Amino acid sequence: SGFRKMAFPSGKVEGCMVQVTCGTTTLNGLWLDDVVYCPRHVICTSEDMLNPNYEDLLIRKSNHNFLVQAGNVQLRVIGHSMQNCVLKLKVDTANPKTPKYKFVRIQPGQTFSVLACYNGSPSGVYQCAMRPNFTIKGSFLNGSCGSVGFNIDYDCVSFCYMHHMELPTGVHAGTDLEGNFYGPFVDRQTAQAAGTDTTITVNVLAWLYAAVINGDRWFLNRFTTTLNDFNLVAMKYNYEPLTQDHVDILGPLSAQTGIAVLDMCASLKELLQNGMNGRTILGSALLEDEFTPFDVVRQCSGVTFQ
Amino acid sequence: SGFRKMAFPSGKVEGCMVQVTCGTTTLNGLWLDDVVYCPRHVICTSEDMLNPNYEDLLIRKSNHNFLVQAGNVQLRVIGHSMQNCVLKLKVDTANPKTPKYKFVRIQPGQTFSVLACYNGSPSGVYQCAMRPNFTIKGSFLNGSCGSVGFNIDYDCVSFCYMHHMELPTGVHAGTDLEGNFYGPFVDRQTAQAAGTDTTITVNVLAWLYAAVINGDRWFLNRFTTTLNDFNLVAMKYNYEPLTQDHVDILGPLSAQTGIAVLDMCASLKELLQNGMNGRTILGSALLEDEFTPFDVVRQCSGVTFQ
Lengths: 306, 306
What we know:
The structure is a homodimer. Chain A is an alpha+beta fold. Among the domains of chain A are: 11-91, Trypsin-like serine proteases (Thrombin, subunit H, Beta Barrel), CATH 2.40.10; 201-301, main proteinase (3clpro) structure, domain 3 (Orthogonal Bundle). Chain A has helices spanning 11-14, 54-59, 201-213, 227-236, 244-249, 251-257, 261-274, 293-301; strands at residues 17-22, 25-32, 35-39, 66-70, 73-75, 77-83, 86-91, 101-103, 111-118, 121-129, 148-153, 156-166, 172-175. In chain A, strand 1 and strand 2 form a beta hairpin. At the A-B interface, helix 1, strand 9, strand 10 and helix 8 of A face helix 1, strand 9, strand 10 and helix 8 of B. Chains A, B: It is found in: Host cytoplasm; Host Golgi apparatus; Host nucleus.
C-alpha cells in the first residue's frame, strides 16, 4: 500500500546523456544510435539568445566546433543538422547503450519522468505532468538544457520532451524530440506568455481513485451529478472539462473500486466548492493532478519494466 | 529554478536487482559482487510469517531451494547465510554491473531514493525520508520486499535500506544492508507499534531556505527568536528539537540567502502557531520535511554523479 509520485527507473536514459559544447556554451545531449540530439541554442552565446538567427548562426558553425563528451570519452561530430529546434549531431560511433526507443509527442495532461542533467551527467529524476498550457513545472538550473523527459513501456523508452528554456516566470518549456515546441514558445530570450494553466481533471479523478484504493474514503459524498453539471463547476475552478473519453479511460478504476465515474465527479465537485477543510488526501492538502489514470493503475498493480 | 522531490538516478541500482524465489514466495534481491542480499522471510510461507522460527526454517532450506533470477538468466546459489534479518545468498557469478558501493546505516531524518521492484524488475523510483520513528511512508505492493533505498555519492552508491514489511497501519519497515531493522520492528506478521512520528525540523528549515532561493519569501517574518524558545514551540507541534549541530548544518544556506538560522526559525515558529492560511510554499500547502539541508544545496547547486 501507499502512494508516491514515482518516476520511471532512469538507467536506460542515463547511458544516453552526453555533454555538448559549442563555443562557450555547454548543455546536455541525447545520444541515440549515432545521432546526438540537443537544443539548437547550444550554438548561441548569451547575446545571441536575445535575437538569434539560427540558420545564420548554424552556418557560422562547423562539425569541428561541436565537442560531444560522454564521461571521459570524446565523440567526433561527422555531421550536423537542424530539425526545427533540435540539432542533430551525427557522431562517428553509435551509442552501445542505445535502448529500444520511440519518439512521441505527448498530449497536455500526460505525465513523464525527467532526468535532470548538468554537463551531460545525471543529477536526479522526477515525475511531472505536461501542463495544459504546454509548460512543465520542473527543476532546471543553468546548464540543464537538453535534459529529456521519457516514459518507459516495458522494454521501450518513449522520449517525449527535451528541455530548452526557463521562461522569465520560472516555468519550463521545451520540445518533443523532433524539435517542435510544446506550446507557443520559441527558443529566444524574450518575454513569452504561457496560457492560463488549468488543472487536469481526469488526473485528479484518477488520484481520487488511488486514494480510495489506499483507504482514504472520507470524500466519498452523499451526492451524484451529471457530466454537463460537473463541467459547469469545473470550468469555474479552472479545471479542464471532462469528456466521455475521460470517463471511458477511468472505467477500470471505477470497476476496481465499485464507484461510478460520475459518482467520483460528485465527490470532486464537492471538494472544489467547499475545499478540503484542513484535511488531507494521500498526504496532500491540495488536489493532485500529476497522476494519469494509467499511472494509478500502474502503481496500484505494480507493473514492471526491463 | 524550481524545486522538485528529486530521486537519485537509479541506473547503478537497477542492474543489481534480482528475483529471489524460495518455495512459493518470490521477492527482490540485491546482487552485489557475488552475494545476493534479500529479506530472510523469503523462506517463509504465509503461515510461517505469523510466528517464524528463522533458524529452524532456514535449516530446512538448502542451497538448491533458492532460485535467483536476473532477467532470463539464472544464478546458482553456492552458499547461504543469515545476517540478522538478511539472507546472504552466495551465487557462483559476480554481478558484472556491481557499482562502487557502501553499506550505510542512516539516521532518522535522512533522505534516500527507493527503487521499487517486483519480481526483480524495477517499476519506479522515488525519494523519501527515514521518519524519526524509523518507518518510511513508501509505495510497496506485495512482492516488493527486498527493494532497496540508496544514496549516490558521485561514483559511490550508498545502500541504506532494504524493504521488509508493511505494518498493519500501512507504513513500511525494513533494515540496513547488514540486516538490522531500523526501529523496534521484527520480521513477523504481528501487530507492531511505531513510535510517535515527528516532523524533521532541520529539513523543514532547509526547505524554507529552498523556498527563499526560489523566490517564495512571504513567510519571512518581522520576528526573531532563540533556540530555546523555538524548541519550546516545536515540541508542541510534534517537531523534533533543533540543536546547534542543526544550526551548523544550515550554515551555508544561511550564508547564501543572508538569513540567519534563528531568523528562519522565527518564521517557521510563526508558520506553526498560525498556519499557512490557504497559501502555499513551493507548491505545497503543508510544510515539507523530506529535504535535508544537503538535498537543498545539491539541487540548488546542481551537483551531478557518475
